């Protein structure tokens, strides 16, 4: 409904709709991720080497071929898993038979 | 240096704590109050925490 | 003493159970129905719980 002859003072930086939108987006984000698989069993050292595929000049060291001993469906078993991680997702670590670990662990 | 009133009230307890990595363990020492320590016989360890 | 219609219906299964202490295990056994477990191939074990 257009309001003819109605002048209203606005202030976009004092608008509480922004604060509500912010809180609603964060809350929905957390609600979405809460009932999901946690990766705490993967906070182990990784044995990482250079990717053996053809690497362009700008991808040298960006992506690494990492391997680790992950848990399985059963508590008493382990499996060796190979995966490619971006350098940004791993950090150097000194260990016996490993080179890197996940940045957030 | 422990006075007579505090004999047996504190113990220097060694244990293998978990750490950031799932398959690593961190050997640590801590001082616990006697009221928080309950005896166990075991073979290597001497006590466990009262609520475990 | 198992009757003719119960042969293989119930199994006596042993396993390494956890305990109230993280660094100790208890060897236990229990009777499971065949419908609760499925065959598994391993060095020391031969069944797992059907839903795991």
């Amino acid at each position: 409904i257009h309001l003819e002859n109605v002048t209203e003072e606005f202030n976009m930086w004092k608008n509480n709709m922004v604060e509500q939108m912010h809180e609603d987006i964060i809350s929905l984000w957390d609600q979405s991720l809460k009932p999901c698989v946690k990766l705490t069993p993967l906070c182990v050292g990784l044995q990482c080497t250079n990717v053996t595929n053809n690497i362009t000049d700008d991808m040298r060291g960006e992506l690494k071929n990492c391997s680790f001993n992950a848990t399985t469906e059963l508590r008493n078993k382990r499996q060796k898993v190979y995966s490619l991680f971006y350098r940004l997702d791993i950090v150097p670590m000194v260990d016996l038979w490993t080179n890197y670990r996940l940045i957030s662990c | 240096n422990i006075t007579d009133d505090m004999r047996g009230e504190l113990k220097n307890c060694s244990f293998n704590a978990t750490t950031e990595l799932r398959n690593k363990r961190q050997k640590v020492y801590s001082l616990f109050y006697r009221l928080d320590i309950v005896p166990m016989v075991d073979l290597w360890t001497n006590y466990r925490l009262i609520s475990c | 003493n198992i009757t003719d219609d119960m042969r293989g219906e119930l199994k006596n299964c042993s396993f390494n159970a956890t305990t109230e202490l993280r660094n100790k295990r208890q060897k236990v056994y229990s009777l499971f129905y065949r419908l609760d477990i499925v065959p598994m191939v391993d060095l020391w074990t031969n069944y797992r719980l059907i839903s795991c």
Partner: antibody
Amino acid sequence: DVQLVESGGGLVKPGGSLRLSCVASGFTFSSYLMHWVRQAPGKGLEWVSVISESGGNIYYSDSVKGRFTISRDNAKNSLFLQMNSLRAEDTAVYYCTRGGLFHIDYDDDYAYYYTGRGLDYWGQGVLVTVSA
Amino acid sequence: DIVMTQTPLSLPVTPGEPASISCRSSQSLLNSEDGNTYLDWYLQKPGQSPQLLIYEVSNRASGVPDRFSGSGSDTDFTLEISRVEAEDVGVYYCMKALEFPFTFGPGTKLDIK
């Protein structure tokens, strides 16, 4: 009384192959890391390679990758090193050593413990000569 | 990428007097996971396989006389012997032990004047 005795050395022509065997006694073989180190005549010590207790994790020095393969048999309490495509630069006395103590704590969710002691006990040494 | 060097390649010492063998790493050998520095010292007597003298920067190996003592910073290390006898001379090697790819330095010859 920790003992390590190497055998299987001798003279091999360049391009051939030779397998050394280190027999250990006095300790549980499956509990310790095993290392090979070599010393060329007139040179200092050169680290060659290490094999884990299970044999699942193997690492070689860059100078010996490809040409050397390390393996072990815990039931027989012995360590093997298979050399291929030997070069004149590979003439050396080879030694096997015991590494640190590695333990898998089964009760503690198969946790890993390791105590390092350097290269600990060293063997007698076996000479491999590459020449023709 | 990590190498070891030793300045005193020839260090004759009067028997019965103290001596020390220095060693430098091209990179820090400190392990940030536990704060320990991993560096071993070995001695190869003529005609014998090398034996372990010191494990880690300052931990003496069992069976080693108490006269041998290691010390050092993350990159600058010294092995000191309070008195050197004929039984304590031969070729010394500095071995890095932080990263798994272990290497040895050029070594030094300790002898008797």
